[PDB]
C-alpha cells in the first residue's frame, strides 16, 4: 500500500498520506480530522485487511495524524502510487505540486499561498496551511501532496471540485514528521 491509497476507519474513508518510520517502527501519516476519534484502520471497505491503529492525532489547529502499522505482511512502499519519495521539503509560492487521493486519483497544480488560515466552522480552525489551485473531493483527505520525489503536505480540505476546478489546502508534512520524530523512506 502506498501514498494516495484508500484507508478505512470505523467512520469513513480517507487516503494514506505517506509511509514513514522511526527506527524499525512503521507508521503512516494521514489527516488529523481522519484520525480524530478513529482507533483501527483497514485497507478495504470490507474491513478484512487490518493496517494498524492510531498513535496520534492533531486537529483542529493543525491537521495531521499518525497510524502505527500492526499488519506485518502488507507491503509498505515509500512511494506515492508508483512515484518514489526520497525526502521532504517546504512548500514555496509558485511551486508545482501533485496530489494523489483515493477518490480522484492524481491531479497537479501550484502552491498559491502559505500560512493560510482555514475555518471549517464549529471551532475547527486550522492554521499555517499551504494553499493551492489543486482540486480534491471527499475521500481525498490525508492524501499526499508531493513535488517530484519530495514530500510536501497532507490533504486537508478546501472547496470546488475536479470538474470545475477548486482550491485545496494542505498541512505541511515537515511539521508532522517533526512532531512524531519520523521520516520518509
Amino acid at each position: 500500500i502506498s501514498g494516495g491509497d484508500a484507508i478505512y476507519s470505523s467512520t469513513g474513508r480517507c487516503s494514506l498520506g505517506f509511509n514513514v518510520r522511526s527506527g524499525s517502527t512503521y507508521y503512516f501519516l494521514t489527516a488529523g480530522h481522519c484520525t480524530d476519534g478513529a482507533t483501527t484502520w483497514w485497507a478495504n471497505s470490507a474491513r478484512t485487511t487490518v493496517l494498524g491503529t492510531t498513535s496520534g492525532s492533531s486537529f483542529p489547529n493543525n491537521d495531521y495524524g499518525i497510524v502505527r502499522y500492526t499488519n506485518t505482511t502488507i507491503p509498505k512502499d515509500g512511494t506515492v502510487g508508483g512515484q518514489d519519495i526520497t525526502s521532504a521539503a517546504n512548500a514555496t509560492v509558485g511551486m508545482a505540486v501533485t496530489r494523489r487521493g483515493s477518490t480522484t486519483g492524481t491531479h497537479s497544480g501550484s502552491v498559491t499561498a502559505l500560512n493560510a488560515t482555514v475555518n471549517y466552522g464549529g471551532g475547527d480552525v486550522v492554521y499555517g496551511m499551504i494553499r493551492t489551485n489543486v482540486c480534491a473531493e471527499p475521500g481525498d483527505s490525508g492524501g499526499p501532496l508531493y513535488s517530484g520525489t519530495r514530500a510536501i503536505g497532507l490533504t486537508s480540505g478546501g472547496s470546488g471540485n475536479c470538474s470545475s476546478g477548486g482550491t485545496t489546502f494542505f498541512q505541511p508534512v515537515t511539521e508532522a514528521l517533526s512532531a512524531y520524530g519520523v521520516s520518509v523512506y
Binding site: 469513513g12 474513508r13 481522519c34 473531493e137 471527499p138 475521500g139 481525498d140 472547496s159
Partner: protein
C-alpha cells in the same frame, strides 16, 4: 443532518456519503449542506449512504 451553520467556505475531504434528492451521492455532510445552500434550499436529504 442540519444545514443551518451553512454555508461554510471550506470542507474537510473525508468520505461519509449521503444521498441527495437529486440522486447525487454527496461525499460528506459539509459537501451536502453547501449544495443545499447553493440550491437555495431546494435540495433535500434522501437517505444516508450512497444513492
Amino acid at each position: 443532518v442540519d444545514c443551518s451553520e451553512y454555508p461554510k467556505p471550506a470542507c474537510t475531504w473525508e468520505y461519509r456519503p449521503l444521498c441527495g434528492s437529486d440522486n447525487k451521492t454527496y461525499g460528506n455532510k459539509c459537501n451536502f449542506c453547501n449544495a443545499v445552500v447553493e440550491s437555495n434550499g431546494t435540495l433535500t436529504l434522501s437517505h444516508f449512504g450512497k444513492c
